[PDB]
Amino acid sequence: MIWKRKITLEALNAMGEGNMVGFLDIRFEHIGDDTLEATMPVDSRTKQPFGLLHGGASVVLAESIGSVAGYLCTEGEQKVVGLEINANHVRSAREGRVRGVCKPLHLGSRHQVWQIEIFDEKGRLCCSSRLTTAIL
Amino acid sequence: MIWKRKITLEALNAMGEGNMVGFLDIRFEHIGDDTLEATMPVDSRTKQPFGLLHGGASVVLAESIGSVAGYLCTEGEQKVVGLEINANHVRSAREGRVRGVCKPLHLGSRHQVWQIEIFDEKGRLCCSSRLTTAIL
Numbered sequence: 001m002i003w004k005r006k007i008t009l010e011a012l013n014a015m016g017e018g019n020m021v022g023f024l025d026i027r028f029e030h031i032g033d034d035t036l037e038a039t040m041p042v043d044s045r046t047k048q049p050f051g052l053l054h055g056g057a058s059v060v061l062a063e064s065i066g067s068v069a070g071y072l073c074t075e076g077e078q079k080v081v082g083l084e085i086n087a088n089h090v091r092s093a094r095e096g097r098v099r100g101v102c103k104p105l106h107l108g109s110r111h112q113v114w115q116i117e118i119f120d121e122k123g124r125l126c127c128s129s130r131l132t133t134a135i136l
Numbered sequence: 137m138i139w140k141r142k143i144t145l146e147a148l149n150a151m152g153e154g155n156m157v158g159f160l161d162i163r164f165e166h167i168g169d170d171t172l173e174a175t176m177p178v179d180s181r182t183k184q185p186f187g188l189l190h191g192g193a194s195v196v197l198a199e200s201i202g203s204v205a206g207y208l209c210t211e212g213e214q215k216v217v218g219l220e221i222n223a224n225h226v227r228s229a230r231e232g233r234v235r236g237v238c239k240p241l242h243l244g245s246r247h248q249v250w251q252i253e254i255f256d257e258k259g260r261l262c263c264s265s266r267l268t269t270a271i272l
């Protein structure tokens with residue numbers, strides 16, 4: 001496994017309480033040996049004014065999963081912050097929940113790179129994102 | 137003057153009601169002849185679990201300003217969607233509100249490129265972002 005920090009799904013989900021992760025109902029649903037997965041609803045909290053999932057909301061999901069994945073790949077008092085984030089909005093979503101799957105592209109001593117793909121309920125790719133973190 | 141749609145600040149702010157823009161108290165504060173400005177709080181709705189402004193929240197602001205600027209540079213039943221987004225998190229924001237300033241880099245027939253810079257209350261740059269839209 002890639003993780004250096006051991007965490008339960010419960011404890012991972014508790015991290016979001018009282019911050020943006022909790023406010024957007026972002027829910028971590030699976031911790032794999034080398035992947036992390038979370039879902040997020042498409043509703044008033046995350047839509048843009050024309051009824052689509054807000055592009056920014058997709059990026060919130062991507063940066064949330066990638067950043068905490070990165071954090072879990074550090075140890076002790078190391079911190080991880082997002083340094084650069086990018087995404088392509090390949091398909092819109094209008095309802096239900098979307099699901100982001102995060103995998104590592106680079107796990108360095110000082111930086112990491114994470115790939116997050118976000119799918120709708122039909123397994124259709126909606127957002128492809130890449131996140132670069134800095135380890136502090 | 138780049139705009140093709142005439143809109144008041146009040147009507148522009150009205151667009152965000154019932155969606156993520158209003159939820160996060162993103163407020164448009166100035167419409168220039170070639171710039172658009174909106175602010176966003178740094179609080180429990182937009183922070184990450186360690187107290188910083190969530191990287192994705194910065195992108196929510198960038199996409200919210202850039203996409204509607206894009207829309208305001210089209211006419212009639214034309215639609216604008218975010219296609220590609222990138223953002224550099226160069227300084228953390230921790231309190232108050234951040235201020236996003238959006239300027240056009242390219243205004244095309246079927247695509248636009250928008251630059252959004254987001255500053256903290258002390259005027260320091262915190263996020264530098266580029267949004268590419270498609271006109272439908």
Ligand SMILES: CC(C)(COP(=O)(O)OP(=O)(O)OC[C@H]1O[C@@H](n2cnc3c(N)ncnc32)[C@H](O)[C@@H]1OP(=O)(O)O)[C@@H](O)C(=O)NCCC(=O)NCCSCC(=O)c1ccc(O)cc1O
Binds near residue numbers: 048052056203217270
């Ligand atoms: C349009 C693309 C960007 C490019 O692919 P392509 O080759 O150019 O075109 P495709 O052939 O692949 O067609 C794809 C689908 O598009 C539909 N459509 C076509 N024509 C029209 C039309 N005239 N009218 C309507 N729809 C049309 C088609 O029916 C088609 O459906 P299907 O055939 O599949 O049934 C596509 O990748 C896409 O939609 N990505 C998601 C974009 C996204 O959700 N971004 C994030 C959200 S927007 C930013 C935001 O958050 C934001 C924030 C605040 C704010 O104030 C405002 C804000 O905007």
Ligand SMILES: CC(C)(COP(=O)(O)OP(=O)(O)OC[C@H]1O[C@@H](n2cnc3c(N)ncnc32)[C@H](O)[C@@H]1OP(=O)(O)O)[C@@H](O)C(=O)NCCC(=O)NCCSCC(=O)c1ccc(O)cc1O
Binds near residue numbers: 067081082185227
């Ligand atoms: C520290 C950098 C990463 C590199 O800086 P650089 O290349 O050297 O550039 P500068 O030389 O200009 O330095 C600038 C200022 O920074 C200070 N500074 C330097 N070193 C340290 C340090 N070790 N500690 C503290 N401060 C440090 C410097 O002293 C200087 O301060 P001043 O004295 O001038 O007042 C900086 O670019 C940065 O903080 N970007 C924002 C990151 C961010 O907020 N991302 C988004 C949020 S995190 C991701 C997320 O959303 C997320 C979501 C869910 C989740 O579960 C978890 C999540 O994490």
